[PDB]
Amino acid sequence: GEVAQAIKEVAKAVAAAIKEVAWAIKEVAQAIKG
Amino acid sequence: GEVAQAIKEVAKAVAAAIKEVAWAIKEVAQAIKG
Amino acid sequence: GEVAQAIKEVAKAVAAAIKEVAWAIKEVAQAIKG
Amino acid sequence: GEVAQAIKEVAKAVAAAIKEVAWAIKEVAQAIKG
Amino acid sequence: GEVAQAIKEVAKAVAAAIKEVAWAIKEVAQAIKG
Amino acid sequence: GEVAQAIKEVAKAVAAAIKEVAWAIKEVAQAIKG
Amino acid sequence: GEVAQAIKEVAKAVAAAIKEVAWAIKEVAQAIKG
Ligand code: NA
Ligand code: NA
């Protein structure tokens, strides 16, 4: 159904974007270590 | 449907904004490295 | 409809607030760089 | 309606909290500048 | 209604947790200043 | 009801995860202080 | 039901992603400490 599919898109898109934030923060850690 | 379309808008808008956060954090990493 | 409109308000308000976070992080990068 | 009002409360409360995060990050930038 | 009440709980719990993030970031600002 | 229960699970899981972020940021503050 | 299951997926995916952010921030704390 369209509502369920839209909610699954929230899960997918928002989780993926938040994982991009996590990766950027790992890049901060790497810069500090360097 | 309007509810499904609104939920898709949450996915799109919130994910895009979170990506902006990731990019800004990458700028912090670059600032430290430099 | 009121439910769809409320969900659109979540998209708008939450995305805008997250963009403010991104901008503040840009300010951190600028501070580090001098 | 109660569901629409509850969703509006999500928009208001979560956006306001995220703005507090943005402001705290601005304070970090000003600390670094000092 | 149970759905409206659950949505209100999202607003309450998620906003409160995000405020804790803001407070922690203020601690980082204070640590830098010290 | 299953929808209300699922929404309550969003409140619980997401708030708890955000609290982990707050703690991690307190650890950054401690690292800077030390 | 499909809507309830989709909402549970939001809880799971978004919480997991936010935990990844917490772990990345811990890496920053460790980098500062080192
Ligand atoms: Na980068
Ligand atoms: Na990650």
Numbering used by the authors:
A (entry chain C), B (entry chain A), C (entry chain B), D (entry chain F), E (entry chain G), F (entry chain D), ...: 1 to 34
What did the paper state?
For example, CC-Tri and CC-Tet exchanged with each other, as did the higher-order CCs, CC-Pent2, CC-Hex2, and CC-Hept. To address this, using the insight from the data and analysis presented here, we have tested two different strategies for increasing specificity of coiled coils: (i) alternate placement of salt bridge-promoting residues, lysine and glutamate to discriminate the tetramer from the trimer; and (ii) incorporation of hendecad repeats to separate the α-helical barrels.
For instance, in 11-amino acid, hendecad repeats core-forming residues are spaced 3-4-4 apart at the a, d, and h sites of a → k repeats.16,63–67 Consequently, while heptad repeats drive association of left-handed CCs, hendecads lead to right-handed quaternary structures.16,63–67 We reasoned that replacing heptad with hendecad repeats at different locations in the pentamer, hexamer, and heptamer sequences should alter the hydrophobic seams and, in turn, might confer homo-specificity in the resulting sequences. For CC-Pent2 and CC-Hept, initially, we replaced the third and second heptads, respectively, with hendecad repeats to give CC-Pent2-hen3 and CC-Hept-hen2, and using the Leu-at-h variants for both. Unfortunately, FAM-CC-Hept-hen2 was not soluble in PBS buffer, so we switched to a heptamer sequence with Ile in the a sites and Val at d and h (CC-Hept-IV-hen2). The second strategy differentiates the α-helical barrels, CC-Pent2, CC-Hex2, and CC-Hept, by introducing hendecad repeats in a pentamer and heptamer to give CC-Pent2-hen3 and CC-Hept-IV-hen2. Fluorescence measurements show minimal exchange between a revised set of CC peptides: CC-Di, CC-Tri, CC-Tet*, CC-Pent2-hen3, CC-Hex2, and CC-Hept-IV-hen2. We have denoted this group of peptides as the Orthogonal Coiled-coil basis set.
